[PDB]
Design an enzyme around this catalytic site. Structure first.
Site, PDB file in Angstrom:
ATOM      1  N   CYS A 228      -1.586   3.926   0.865  1.00 24.56           N
ATOM      2  CA  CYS A 228      -1.352   4.389   2.231  1.00 24.56           C
ATOM      3  C   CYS A 228      -0.001   5.110   2.254  1.00 24.56           C
ATOM      4  CB  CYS A 228      -1.353   3.190   3.214  1.00 24.56           C
ATOM      5  SG  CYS A 228       0.184   2.258   3.057  1.00 24.56           S
TER       6      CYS A 228
ATOM      7  N   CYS B 284       0.836  -1.243   0.000  1.00 28.11           N
ATOM      8  CA  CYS B 284       0.000   0.000   0.000  1.00 28.11           C
ATOM      9  C   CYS B 284       0.852   1.267   0.000  1.00 28.11           C
ATOM     10  CB  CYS B 284      -0.992   0.006   1.210  1.00 28.11           C
ATOM     11  SG  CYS B 284      -0.227   0.230   2.856  1.00 28.11           S
TER      12      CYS B 284
END
Ligand code: NMN
EC number: 3.2.2.-
Length: 252
Positions: free
Chosen positions: A157, A75
């Site tokens: 992320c 991520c």
């Protein structure tokens, strides 16, 4: 025939065989996708658009394919891009520093392909497919990319990077997939920063394009979502790619 139904290029020749071969190749290379049944993937991809009106495609049509193509991507290593795919791909090829959408099974399957079907026949249309602008935006190809790009942006992320084309009159374009879908689907709970790399097309010496009005607009939009924004100029993309390949070489 001298006139086509739609205004866009028709389905890519040997589409079925091409998707199938790509799925086989991808699942052979990527161990986490080892088990995927490529026939099943083809079937789900087909099911999304065959026998359907190619101006009436929805994200729901692609859900069976999305399910089959579920995949974990690190991520924190996501690279988004806008209208500059070649550099983005050449960069992630060096040592897998980051992952673009086209490095995922589903992005890999569809990259550079066109496809559409017909209402009330099971035929693929090889003569024309809807143009997004002239015909309809809810066509099989546009709806596919919107669906998969949303999911890819939702998975990001930490620090997410984006390469932008500094030679376009709109370096950041609010109408692009990046600007209309990805920007709005980064999850502020997870994403600390969006860092843009503005790629110069201007040879030699050039401006601080991180000051461009469209970059300031992107900064404002991202900042207002409670995500930090960072920008960097890449003045010589040739040198950049050489530095990626051979860092601490010299002059890097
Ligand atoms: N490979 C493709 O053709 C393709 C198409 C649409 C969206 N995307 C995704 O959106 C971005 C590129 O689209 P835009 O150039 O419309 O911004 C990339 O970040 C990629 O994640 C890729």
């Amino acid at each position: 025939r001298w006139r086509q139904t739609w205004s866009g290029p028709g389905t890519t020749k040997r589409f079925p065989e091409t998707v199938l071969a790509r799925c086989v190749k991808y699942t052979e290379i990527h161990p986490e996708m080892r088990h995927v049944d490529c026939q099943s993937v083809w079937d789900a991809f087909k099911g999304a658009f065959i026998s359907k009106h190619p101006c009436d495609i929805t994200e729901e049509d692609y859900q069976p394919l999305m399910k089959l193509g579920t995949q974990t991507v690190p991520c924190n290593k996501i690279l988004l891009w806008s209208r500059i795919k070649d550099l983005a791909h050449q960069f992630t090829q060096v040592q897998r520093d980051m992952f673009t959408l086209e490095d995922t099974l589903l992005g890999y399957l569809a990259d550079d392909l066109t496809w559409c079907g017909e209402f009330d026949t099971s035929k693929i249309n090889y003569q024309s497919c809807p143009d997004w602008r002239k015909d309809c935006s809810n066509n099989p190809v546009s709806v596919f990319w919107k669906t998969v790009s949303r999911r890819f942006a939702e998975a990001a992320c930490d620090v997410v990077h984006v390469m932008l084309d500094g030679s376009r009159s709109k370096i950041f374009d609010k109408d692009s997939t990046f600007g209309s879908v990805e920007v709005h689907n980064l999850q502020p709970e997870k994403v600390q920063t969006l860092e843009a790399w503005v790629i110069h097309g201007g040879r030699e010496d050039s401006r601080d394009l991180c000051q461009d009005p469209t970059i300031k607009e992107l900064e404002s939009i991202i900042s207002k979502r409670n995500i930090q924004f960072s920008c960097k100029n890449i003045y010589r993309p040739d040198k950049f790619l050489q530095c990626v390949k051979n860092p601490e070489d010299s002059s890097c």
